Short mmCIF file of C-alpha atoms in Angstrom, two decimals:
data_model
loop_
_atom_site.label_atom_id
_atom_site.label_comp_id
_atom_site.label_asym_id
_atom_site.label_seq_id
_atom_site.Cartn_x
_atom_site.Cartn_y
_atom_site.Cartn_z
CA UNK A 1 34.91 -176.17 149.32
CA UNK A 2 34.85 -172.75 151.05
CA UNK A 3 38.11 -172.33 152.43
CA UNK A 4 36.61 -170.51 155.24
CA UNK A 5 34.66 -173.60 156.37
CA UNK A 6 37.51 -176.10 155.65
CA UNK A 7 39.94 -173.58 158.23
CA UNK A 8 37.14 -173.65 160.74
CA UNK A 9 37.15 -177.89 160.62
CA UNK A 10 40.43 -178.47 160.31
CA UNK A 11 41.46 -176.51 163.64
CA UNK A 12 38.39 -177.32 165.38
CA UNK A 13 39.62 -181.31 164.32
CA UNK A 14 43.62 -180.38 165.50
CA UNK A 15 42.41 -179.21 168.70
CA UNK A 16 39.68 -182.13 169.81
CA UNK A 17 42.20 -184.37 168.66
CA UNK A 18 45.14 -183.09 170.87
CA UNK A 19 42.62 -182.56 173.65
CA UNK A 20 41.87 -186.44 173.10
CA UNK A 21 45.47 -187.70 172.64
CA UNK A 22 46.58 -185.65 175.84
CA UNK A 23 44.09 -186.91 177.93
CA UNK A 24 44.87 -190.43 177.29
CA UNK A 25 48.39 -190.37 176.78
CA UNK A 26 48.38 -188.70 180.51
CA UNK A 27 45.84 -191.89 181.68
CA UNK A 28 48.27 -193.87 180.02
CA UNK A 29 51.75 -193.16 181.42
CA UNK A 30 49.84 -192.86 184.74
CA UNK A 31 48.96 -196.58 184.23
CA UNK A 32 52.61 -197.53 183.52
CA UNK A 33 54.47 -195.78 185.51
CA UNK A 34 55.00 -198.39 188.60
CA UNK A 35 55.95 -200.90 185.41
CA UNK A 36 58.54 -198.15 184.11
CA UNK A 37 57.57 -198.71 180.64
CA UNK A 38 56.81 -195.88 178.09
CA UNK A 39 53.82 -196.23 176.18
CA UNK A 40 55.23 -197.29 172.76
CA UNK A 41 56.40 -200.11 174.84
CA UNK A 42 53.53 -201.21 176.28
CA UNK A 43 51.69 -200.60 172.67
CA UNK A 44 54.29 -203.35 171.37
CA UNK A 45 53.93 -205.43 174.00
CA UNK A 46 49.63 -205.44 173.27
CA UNK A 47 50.18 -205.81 169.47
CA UNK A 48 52.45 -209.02 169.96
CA UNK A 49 50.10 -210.18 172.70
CA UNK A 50 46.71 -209.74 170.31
CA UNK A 51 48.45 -211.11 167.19
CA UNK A 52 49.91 -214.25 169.02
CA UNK A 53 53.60 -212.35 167.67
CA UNK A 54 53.62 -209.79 165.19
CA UNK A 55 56.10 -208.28 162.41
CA UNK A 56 58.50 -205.11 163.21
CA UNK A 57 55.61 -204.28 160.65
CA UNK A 58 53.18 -204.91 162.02
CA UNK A 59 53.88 -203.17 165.08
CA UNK A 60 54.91 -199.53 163.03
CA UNK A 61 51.63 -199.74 161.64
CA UNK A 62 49.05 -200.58 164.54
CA UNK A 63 51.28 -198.57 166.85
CA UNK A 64 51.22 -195.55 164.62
CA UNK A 65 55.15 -195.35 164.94
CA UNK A 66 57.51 -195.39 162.22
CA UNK A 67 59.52 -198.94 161.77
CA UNK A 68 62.57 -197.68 162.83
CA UNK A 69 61.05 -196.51 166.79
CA UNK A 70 59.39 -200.12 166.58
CA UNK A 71 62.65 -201.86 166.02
CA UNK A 72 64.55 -199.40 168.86
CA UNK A 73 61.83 -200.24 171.05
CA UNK A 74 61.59 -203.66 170.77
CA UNK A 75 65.44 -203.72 170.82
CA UNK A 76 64.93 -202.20 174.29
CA UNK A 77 62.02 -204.95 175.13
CA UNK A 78 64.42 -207.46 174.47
CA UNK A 79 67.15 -206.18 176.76
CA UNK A 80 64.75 -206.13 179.37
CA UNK A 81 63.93 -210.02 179.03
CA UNK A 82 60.40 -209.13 177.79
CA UNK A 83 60.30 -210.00 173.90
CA UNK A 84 62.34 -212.15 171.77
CA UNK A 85 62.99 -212.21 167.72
CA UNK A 86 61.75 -214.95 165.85
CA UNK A 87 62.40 -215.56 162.28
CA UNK A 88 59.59 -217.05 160.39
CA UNK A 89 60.55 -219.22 157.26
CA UNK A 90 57.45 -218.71 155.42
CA UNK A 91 58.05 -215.51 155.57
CA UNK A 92 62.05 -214.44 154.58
CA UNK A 93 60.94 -209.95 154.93
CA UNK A 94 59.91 -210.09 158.24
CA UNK A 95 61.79 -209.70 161.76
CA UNK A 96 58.78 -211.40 164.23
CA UNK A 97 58.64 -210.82 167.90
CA UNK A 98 56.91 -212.57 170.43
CA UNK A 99 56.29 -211.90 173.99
CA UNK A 100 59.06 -214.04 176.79
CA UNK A 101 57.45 -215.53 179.63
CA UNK A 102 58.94 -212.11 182.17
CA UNK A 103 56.66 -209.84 179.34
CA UNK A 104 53.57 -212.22 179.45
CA UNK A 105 53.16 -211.94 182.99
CA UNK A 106 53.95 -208.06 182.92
CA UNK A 107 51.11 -207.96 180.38
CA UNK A 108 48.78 -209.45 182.17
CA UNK A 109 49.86 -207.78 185.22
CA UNK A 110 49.28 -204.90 184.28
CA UNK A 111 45.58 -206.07 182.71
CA UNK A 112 44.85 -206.80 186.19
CA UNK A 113 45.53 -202.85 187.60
CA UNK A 114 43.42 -201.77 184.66
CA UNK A 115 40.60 -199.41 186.41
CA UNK A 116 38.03 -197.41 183.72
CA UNK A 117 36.96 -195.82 187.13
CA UNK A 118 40.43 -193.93 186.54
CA UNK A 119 40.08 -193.02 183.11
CA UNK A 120 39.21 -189.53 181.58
CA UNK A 121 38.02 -191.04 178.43
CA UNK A 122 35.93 -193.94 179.98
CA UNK A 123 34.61 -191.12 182.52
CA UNK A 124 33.89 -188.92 179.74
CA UNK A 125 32.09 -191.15 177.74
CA UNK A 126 29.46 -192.28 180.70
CA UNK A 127 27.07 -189.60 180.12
CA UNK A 128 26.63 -190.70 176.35
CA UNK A 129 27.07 -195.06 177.74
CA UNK A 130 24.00 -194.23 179.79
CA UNK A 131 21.73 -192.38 177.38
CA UNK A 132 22.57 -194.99 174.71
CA UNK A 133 23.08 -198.29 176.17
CA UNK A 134 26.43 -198.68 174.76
CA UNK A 135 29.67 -197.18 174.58
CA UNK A 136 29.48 -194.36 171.57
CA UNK A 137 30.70 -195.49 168.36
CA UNK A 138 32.69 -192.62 166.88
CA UNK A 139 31.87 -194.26 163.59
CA UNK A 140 32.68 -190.41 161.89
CA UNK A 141 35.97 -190.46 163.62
CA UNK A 142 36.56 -194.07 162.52
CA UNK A 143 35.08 -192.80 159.06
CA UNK A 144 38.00 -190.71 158.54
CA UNK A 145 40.35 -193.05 160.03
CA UNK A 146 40.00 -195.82 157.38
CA UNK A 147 39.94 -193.07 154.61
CA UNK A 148 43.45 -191.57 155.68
CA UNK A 149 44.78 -195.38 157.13
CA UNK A 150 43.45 -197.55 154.64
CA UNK A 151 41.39 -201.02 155.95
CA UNK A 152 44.45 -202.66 156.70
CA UNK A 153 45.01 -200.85 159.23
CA UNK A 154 41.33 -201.32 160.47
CA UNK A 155 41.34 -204.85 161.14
CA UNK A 156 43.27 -204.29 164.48
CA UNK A 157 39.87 -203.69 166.19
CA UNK A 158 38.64 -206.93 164.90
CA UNK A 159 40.28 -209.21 167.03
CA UNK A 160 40.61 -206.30 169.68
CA UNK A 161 39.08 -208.86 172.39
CA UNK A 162 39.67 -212.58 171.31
CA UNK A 163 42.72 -213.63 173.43
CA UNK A 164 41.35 -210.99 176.48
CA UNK A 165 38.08 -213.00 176.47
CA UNK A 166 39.93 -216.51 177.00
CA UNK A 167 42.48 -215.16 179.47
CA UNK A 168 40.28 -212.77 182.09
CA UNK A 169 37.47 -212.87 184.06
CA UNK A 170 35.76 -209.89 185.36
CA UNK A 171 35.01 -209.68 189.39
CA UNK A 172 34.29 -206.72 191.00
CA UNK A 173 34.79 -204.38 187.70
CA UNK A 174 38.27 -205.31 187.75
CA UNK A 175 40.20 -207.84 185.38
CA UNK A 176 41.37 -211.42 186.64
CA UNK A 177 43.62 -213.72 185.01
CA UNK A 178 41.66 -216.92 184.60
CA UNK A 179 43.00 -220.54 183.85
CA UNK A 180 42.39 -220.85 180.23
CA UNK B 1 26.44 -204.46 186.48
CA UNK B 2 26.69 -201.58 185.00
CA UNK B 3 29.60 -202.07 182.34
CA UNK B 4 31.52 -205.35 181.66
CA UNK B 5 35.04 -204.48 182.44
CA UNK B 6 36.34 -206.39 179.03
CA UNK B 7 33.85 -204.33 177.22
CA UNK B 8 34.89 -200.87 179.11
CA UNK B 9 38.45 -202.13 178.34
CA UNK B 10 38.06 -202.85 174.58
CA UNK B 11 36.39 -199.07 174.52
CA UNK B 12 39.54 -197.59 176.26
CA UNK B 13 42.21 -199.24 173.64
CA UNK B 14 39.57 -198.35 170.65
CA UNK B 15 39.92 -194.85 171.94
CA UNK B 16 43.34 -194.89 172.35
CA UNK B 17 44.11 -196.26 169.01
CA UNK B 18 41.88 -194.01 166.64
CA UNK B 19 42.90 -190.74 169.09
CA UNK B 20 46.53 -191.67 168.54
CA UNK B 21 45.89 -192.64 164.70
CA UNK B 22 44.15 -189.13 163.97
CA UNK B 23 46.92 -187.04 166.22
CA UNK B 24 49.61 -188.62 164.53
CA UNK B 25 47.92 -187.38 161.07
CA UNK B 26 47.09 -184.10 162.00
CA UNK B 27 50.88 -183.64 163.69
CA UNK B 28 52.86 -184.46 160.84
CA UNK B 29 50.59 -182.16 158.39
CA UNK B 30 51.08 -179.37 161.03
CA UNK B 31 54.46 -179.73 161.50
CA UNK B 32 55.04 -179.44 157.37
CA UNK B 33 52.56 -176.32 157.77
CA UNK B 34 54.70 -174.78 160.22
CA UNK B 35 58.48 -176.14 158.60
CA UNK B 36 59.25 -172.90 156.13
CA UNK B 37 58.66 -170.41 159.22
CA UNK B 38 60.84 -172.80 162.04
CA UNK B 39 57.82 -172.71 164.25
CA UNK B 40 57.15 -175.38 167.26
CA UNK B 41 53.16 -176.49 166.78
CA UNK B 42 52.75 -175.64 170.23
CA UNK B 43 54.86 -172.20 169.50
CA UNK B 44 51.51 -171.98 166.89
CA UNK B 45 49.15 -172.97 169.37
CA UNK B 46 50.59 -170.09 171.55
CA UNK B 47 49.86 -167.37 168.94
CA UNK B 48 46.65 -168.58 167.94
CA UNK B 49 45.65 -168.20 171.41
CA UNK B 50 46.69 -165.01 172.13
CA UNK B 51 45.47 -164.23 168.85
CA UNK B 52 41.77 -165.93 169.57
CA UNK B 53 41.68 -164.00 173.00
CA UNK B 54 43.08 -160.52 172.13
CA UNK B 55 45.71 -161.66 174.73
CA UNK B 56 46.00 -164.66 177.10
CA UNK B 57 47.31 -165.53 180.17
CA UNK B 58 50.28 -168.28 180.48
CA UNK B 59 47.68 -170.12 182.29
CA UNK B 60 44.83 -169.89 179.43
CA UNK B 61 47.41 -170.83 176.82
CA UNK B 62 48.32 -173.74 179.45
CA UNK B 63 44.61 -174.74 179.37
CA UNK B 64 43.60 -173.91 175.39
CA UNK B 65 46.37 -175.17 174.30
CA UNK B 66 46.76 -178.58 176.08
CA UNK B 67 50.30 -177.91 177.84
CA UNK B 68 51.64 -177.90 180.94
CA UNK B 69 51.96 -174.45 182.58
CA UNK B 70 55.51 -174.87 182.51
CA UNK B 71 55.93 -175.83 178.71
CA UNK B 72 53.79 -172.30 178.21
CA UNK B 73 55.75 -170.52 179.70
CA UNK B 74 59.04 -172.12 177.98
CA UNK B 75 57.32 -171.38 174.46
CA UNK B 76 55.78 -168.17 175.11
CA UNK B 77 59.68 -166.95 176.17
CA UNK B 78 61.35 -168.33 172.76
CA UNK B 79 58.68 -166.43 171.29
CA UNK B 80 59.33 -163.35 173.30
CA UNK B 81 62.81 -163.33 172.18
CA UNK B 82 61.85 -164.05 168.53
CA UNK B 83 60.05 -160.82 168.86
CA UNK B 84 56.58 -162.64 167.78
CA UNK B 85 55.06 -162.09 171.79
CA UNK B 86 55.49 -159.73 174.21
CA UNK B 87 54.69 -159.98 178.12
CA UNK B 88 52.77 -157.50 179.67
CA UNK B 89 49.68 -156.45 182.53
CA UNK B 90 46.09 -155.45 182.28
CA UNK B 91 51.13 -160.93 183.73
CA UNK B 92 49.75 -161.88 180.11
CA UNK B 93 51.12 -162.75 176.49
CA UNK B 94 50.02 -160.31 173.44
CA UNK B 95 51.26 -160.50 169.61
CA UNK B 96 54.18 -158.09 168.42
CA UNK B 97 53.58 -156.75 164.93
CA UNK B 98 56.16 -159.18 163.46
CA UNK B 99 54.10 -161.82 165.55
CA UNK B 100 51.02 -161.11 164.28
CA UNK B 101 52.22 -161.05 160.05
CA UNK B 102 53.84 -164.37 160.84
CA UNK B 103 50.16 -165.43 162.04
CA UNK B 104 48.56 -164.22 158.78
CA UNK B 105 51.06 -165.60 156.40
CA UNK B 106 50.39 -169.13 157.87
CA UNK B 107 46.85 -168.50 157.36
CA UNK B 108 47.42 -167.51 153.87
CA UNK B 109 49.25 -170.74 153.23
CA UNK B 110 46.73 -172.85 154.26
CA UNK B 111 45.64 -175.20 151.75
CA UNK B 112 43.17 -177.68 152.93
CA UNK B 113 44.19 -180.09 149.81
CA UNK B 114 47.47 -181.08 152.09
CA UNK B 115 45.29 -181.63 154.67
CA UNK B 116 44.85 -185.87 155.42
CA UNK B 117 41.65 -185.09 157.62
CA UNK B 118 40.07 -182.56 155.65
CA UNK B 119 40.62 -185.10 152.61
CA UNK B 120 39.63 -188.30 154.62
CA UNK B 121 36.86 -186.42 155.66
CA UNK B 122 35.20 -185.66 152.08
CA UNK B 123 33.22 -188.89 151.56
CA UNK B 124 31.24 -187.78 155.05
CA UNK B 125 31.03 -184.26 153.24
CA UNK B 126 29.71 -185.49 149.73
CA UNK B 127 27.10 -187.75 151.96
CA UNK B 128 26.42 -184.83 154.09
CA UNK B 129 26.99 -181.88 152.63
CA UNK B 130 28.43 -180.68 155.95
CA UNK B 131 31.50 -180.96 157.29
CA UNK B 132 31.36 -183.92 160.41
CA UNK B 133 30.09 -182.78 163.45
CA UNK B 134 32.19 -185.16 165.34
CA UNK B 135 29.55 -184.81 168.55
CA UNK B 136 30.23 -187.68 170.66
CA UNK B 137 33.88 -186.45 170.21
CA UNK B 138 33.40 -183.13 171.33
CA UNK B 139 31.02 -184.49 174.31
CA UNK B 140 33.79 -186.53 175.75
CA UNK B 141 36.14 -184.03 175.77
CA UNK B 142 33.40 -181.54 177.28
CA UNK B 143 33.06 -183.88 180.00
CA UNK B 144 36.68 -184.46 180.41
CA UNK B 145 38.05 -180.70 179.73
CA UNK B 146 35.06 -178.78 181.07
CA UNK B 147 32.77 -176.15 179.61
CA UNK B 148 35.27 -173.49 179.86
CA UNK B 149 37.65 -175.06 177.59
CA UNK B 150 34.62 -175.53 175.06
CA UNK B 151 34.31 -171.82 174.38
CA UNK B 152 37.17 -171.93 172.35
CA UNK B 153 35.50 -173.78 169.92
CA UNK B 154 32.83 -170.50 169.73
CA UNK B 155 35.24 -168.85 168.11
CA UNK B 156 34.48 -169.55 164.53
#
């Protein structure tokens, strides 16, 4: 490698991926603030909602958080009525949580304020949805991703949409809870 | 209908994940970067900004480096009273000497090898023989930051 060139990509990389991050993480608390969660929360919250309950583990891993901010967290969760621990026998290692009833409905709650209209990233990514018939892939981004997260960490995307698509209908670009 | 809401909502938490995932990775190698010289990233971000633009405004270092106005100023003042910045008027925010040989000594540390995205990013470069251009990247965050903020990125 020319060190030149690899100085050039690695801050052009640091600073589109702040930029990114920034942007969304703004979009994000914006979202949450009425719920007065913090995002790590809410991140928690989705993972044990798309896994059907998920492992401290788990949750460090698909929330990019170390395991010891996913256990404080979901500490905090529990105080506020919306997780519980669960202890699965099959599996001795883990500490599970699951989302209460309260955290369910605050899920989907919150699901139903969801607006792309009010999103920098969804915004931002029209010009390229309508040029393309699709929302862009990033597949280099992603690329890079699995190389420095390993597959594992990968298969979070995979079921990204199962329980969404059982729960929701759309009507009128915004999200409905539907009887399942 | 333009966009299914599920589908727009799927793209929003793909984005989300993969922007925090590659953040996250390029923070912590940063931070290690920075840990022998007891600099803040964004204390870094300050000086290469300054540095970049021959001198910069507390509102250009607000909008190249990705801070609030008020964080910029709190950063740019520690690193007045390092002695690595000092204010002045053509207010803006110019390297010291001291400031500017604690720039280049980062820069000769650099060593792309401890670098998770420059090494995640070598099977793209062996297929390639490029670096990754990253273009739908860099057109969302035109759209979202503006052209201005792109010109930064014109300084290679």
């Amino acid at each position: 490698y020319d060190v030149k060139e690899a100085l050039v990509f690695t801050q052009k990389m640091a600073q589109l991926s702040k930029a990114l991050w920034k942007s969304i993480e703004k979009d994000w608390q914006q979202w949450l603030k009425p719920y007065d969660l913090n995002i790590n929360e809410h991140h928690i919250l989705w993972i044990a909602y798309q896994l059907n309950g998920a492992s401290i583990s788990e949750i460090a891993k698909f929330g990019v958080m170390h395991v010891s901010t996913a256990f404080n967290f979901s500490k905090k969760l529990e105080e506020r009525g919306y997780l519980r621990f669960s202890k699965r026998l099959n599996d001795k290692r883990n500490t599970y949580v699951q989302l209460t009833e309260e955290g369910t409905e605050v899920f989907w709650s919150l699901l139903e304020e969801f607006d792309p209209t009010r999103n920098a990233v969804f915004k931002g990514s029209q010009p390229l949805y309508h040029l393309f018939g699709k929302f862009p892939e990033v597949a280099e981004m992603m690329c890079m991703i699995r190389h420095i997260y390993g597959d594992d960490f990968m298969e979070i995307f995979e079921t990204s949409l199962t329980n969404i698509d059982n729960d929701f209908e759309s009507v009128n670009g915004k999200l409905k809870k539907k009887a399942k």
